[PDB]
Amino acid sequence: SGFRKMAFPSGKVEGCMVQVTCGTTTLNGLWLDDVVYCPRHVIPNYEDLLIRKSNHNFLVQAGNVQLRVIGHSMQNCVLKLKVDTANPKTPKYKFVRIQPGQTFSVLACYNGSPSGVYQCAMRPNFTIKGSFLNGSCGSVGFNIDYDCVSFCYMHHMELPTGVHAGTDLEGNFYGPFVDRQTAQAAGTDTTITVNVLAWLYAAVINGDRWFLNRFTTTLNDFNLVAMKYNYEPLTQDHVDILGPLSAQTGIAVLDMCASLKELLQNGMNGRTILGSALLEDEFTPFDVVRQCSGVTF
Amino acid sequence: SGFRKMAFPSGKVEGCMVQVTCGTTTLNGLWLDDVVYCPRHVICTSEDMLNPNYEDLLIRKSNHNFLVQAGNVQLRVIGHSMQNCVLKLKVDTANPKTPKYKFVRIQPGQTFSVLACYNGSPSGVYQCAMRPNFTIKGSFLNGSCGSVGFNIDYDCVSFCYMHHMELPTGVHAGTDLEGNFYGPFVDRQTAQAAGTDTTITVNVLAWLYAAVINGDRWFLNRFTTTLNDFNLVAMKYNYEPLTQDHVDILGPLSAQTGIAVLDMCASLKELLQNGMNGRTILGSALLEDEFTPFDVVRQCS
Ligand SMILES: CNC(=O)COC[C@@]1(C(=O)Nc2cncc3ccccc23)CCOc2ccc(Cl)cc21
Ligand SMILES: CNC(=O)COC[C@@]1(C(=O)Nc2cncc3ccccc23)CCOc2ccc(Cl)cc21
Ligand SMILES: [Cl-]
């Protein structure tokens, strides 16, 4: 029993974190095989800025060992520093781009040293509500699939509202952001509906049933209601993905949608669900199954 | 900016997780140097659990009865001893991944990271606190026994918890790494219940200071309070008494924000009285009590 916001074990990623220094800027790099990946803002016309840099300008530090940079290239908003040494701790990995609503673990780092690990979701507005201080750029987001690390995020910036923006490991930003000091704002955010439904199923699995009702709803009526509360539309794909949880608890997805509809129109009334007074949207249906079944890595 | 429930990076602990099997019972062990630590109830059957005589059960065991598995390698047990509620299995190999470590016993209100494991394999990492009633509100399924709680301050891992049981309310009880249970719990299936839990007041105050550091000031008021008046109010909401130690501990956060501890106590009194009125503090509609003053300073600064 119990339901916690749980991150993936960070060990396979910890063995990849390095410190990258260029001039006065120090941030984090991800060392995989013989390449160190980091935000290109460590060096704006980035082709013009990069052409002026030589390999020896980039100081890469893996623990108490200085790696030697033997090449450099830019791929979108990520700088790829070719080093002479392949990381012996390189795990089986992939670079994957995630969609809004998908969750991942963040290994927050400062000076190439991991400081903490937390779980978060790619918001529908493409920002992450992370926890990052100055020096955290280059910290990465990931998931683990069996023994394979899927790198999905690299931290680049903090927006004026305190939320965070970054890229995939191919340097493509999530969201309409640019890596430049300029007026940028996170768009109006919405609630990840499929994730709230997954969290309501997790609450049922843990004995919380007070919010259940005899009612059901159509997918169209639920979406008309959900749109009124700044909730993301629920698609038939989401309904299908919630299938296993529906089968395990005996509560049809549209039956749980009627519960969610009543929760949105009437509130919690002094009650909590899994120790929360708000509807939690940073657990995907897969996170719920994984935690309520004990999948290991 | 931002404030998250943050766990320590689990890598140093992952390299210590092993699977311990004794008879039909399989749980997790913590392999440090040439010793594997695990709950002593691994020697029990589901029947033995009611009134086990662990000394009597252990004396009947030999080293080859304990099967220890580190990854795809079977370690050889060369000795065994019991220290309180923890079984210490001496093995023929020192763990090459043994980090710099200490065994520390924590007090209620202290936080730590839990590396939840099943079959000696890490499944997830989460943050939690030792509740005032000495239980932890974890996420543990059957097979999670032996999963450990820790803090990684600097390069040293401080092991503070080992999971042993789930009480009937879905909460968890366990021991320090010397096998001493936290709370009035015993590793028996006799009727046991968690005492009435309370809110960790010093931690809520620390989290209100974290909210101020992050720009949230809506809950502040022009009032102050005496420590005694705050405690009389706090105890009516099942909040732990705030001691002068807690007030002293909150000193740095008070200095950084410019809000005296007794001023922040007056804001807490008002929040307890009014609720949040549709507002949130650091994205929460409840007062968060699983961030200590040390966690807030570490994360915010
Ligand atoms: C040494 N590195 C830095 O100075 C990082 O600052 C980059 C920076 C940024 O916002 N990053 C930061 C990341 N996380 C948390 C932060 C907290 C406080 C201050 C900065 C933070 C500075 C501000 O404007 C831009 C614009 C565009 C890009 Cl792409 C980045 C940035
Ligand atoms: C593999 N399992 C075991 O070795 C036996 O389980 C131990 C057990 C226990 O409570 N463990 C468990 C730990 N965490 C979460 C759990 C969730 C569901 C079921 C069991 C859980 C079984 C029940 O009664 C006792 C009594 C006292 C002690 Cl100290 C332990 C126990
Ligand atoms: Cl302590």
Q: DSSP assignment of A220-260, as one string?
A: HHHHHHHHHTTBPPPPHHHHHHTHHHHHHHT--HHHHHHHH
Residues 93-152 of B with CB under 8 A from A: 115-119, 121-128, 137-141, 143-144
Say which experimental method was used: X-ray
Which structural domain, as residue segments, surrounds residue A173? Answer: 1-14+92-189
Give the CA angle between residues A143, A145, A149 to the nearest 5°. Answer: 55
Element holding B209 (H helix, E strand): helix B201-213
Report how far residue B99's alpha carbon sits from residue B10's, in angstroms, rounded to the nearest whole number.
Answer: 12
3-state helix, strand, coil in chain A (%, to 5): 25, 30, 45
CB B162 within 8 A of CB B174: yes
Q: Residue A282 maps to which CATH number?
A: 1.10.1840.10
Are A255 and A271 in a shared domain?
yes
Here the tokens at position B300 are 């915010």
| Paired sense of beta strands B156-166 and B172-175, if any | antiparallel
Please identify, among B197, B223, B258, the residue that sits at the C-terminal boundary of a domain. B197
How many Å apart are CA B261 and CA A128, to the nearest integer? 32
Pairing mode, strands A164-167 and A148-158: antiparallel
Q: Phi then psi for A83, rounded to 5 degrees?
A: -115, 160
Q: b/e per residue, B2-14, with b = 16+ CB within 10 A?
A: bbbbbbbbbbbbb
| Domain final residue pick, B82, B99, B116 | B99
Domain boundary among A189, A205, A235: A189
Same domain flag for B190 and B241: no
Residues A2/B139, Cβ–Cβ less than 8 Å: yes
B124 closest CB neighbour out of A1, A15, A291: A291
Q: Does one domain contain both A125 and A9?
A: yes
Cβ(A204)–Cβ(A109) below 8 Å = no
Residue B156 CB partners (closer than 8 Å, separation 6+): B99, B100, B101, B102
**Phi, psi torsion values for A217, nearest 5 degrees:** -150, 165
- Are A81 and A121 in the same domain? no
Query: In this structure, are A214 and A68 located in the same domain?
Result: no
Query: Alpha carbon of B135 to those of A140, B3, B27, B201, B204: distances in Å?
Result: 33, 25, 20, 17, 18
In sequence order, what are the residues at sequence separation of 6 or more whose Cβ sits closer than 8 angstroms to the Cβ of residue A215?
A255, A258, A259, A262
A84 and A111: one domain? no
Same domain, yes or no, for A3 and A113? yes
d(CA A157, CA A39): 10
Nearest-angstrom CA–CA distance, A133 and A108:
9
Neighbouring CB atoms inside 10 A of B88's CB total: 17
With a Cβ cut-off of 6 Å, ligand 2 is lined by A 1; B 25-27, 41, 49, 140-145, 164-166, 187-189
- B132: DSSP letter: T
Contact indicator for A73, A86 with CB cutoff of 8 Å: no
To what resolution in angstroms was this structure determined? 1.9
Q: Tell me: do A57 and A184 sit in the same domain.
A: no
Residue ranges of E strands in B86-146: 86-91, 100-103, 111-118, 121-129
Name the minimum distance, in Å, from the CA of B154 to any CA of chain A: 9
Interface of A with B in 22-51 (CB under 8 A): none
* Tokens 């050889």, located at residue: B76
Q: Is B83 exposed, middle or buried (0-12, 13-18, 19+ CB in 10 A)?
A: middle
Round to whole Å and give the CA distance between B156 and B137: 25
Number of structural domains, chain B? 3
Alpha-carbon distance of B115 to B122, in angstroms, equals 6
Residue A12 CA to residue B169 CA, distance in Å, equals 35
- Are residue B203 and residue B294 in the same domain, yes or no? yes
CA atoms A55, A58, A60, A66: torsion sign? positive
- The verdict on B27 and B86 lying in the same domain is yes
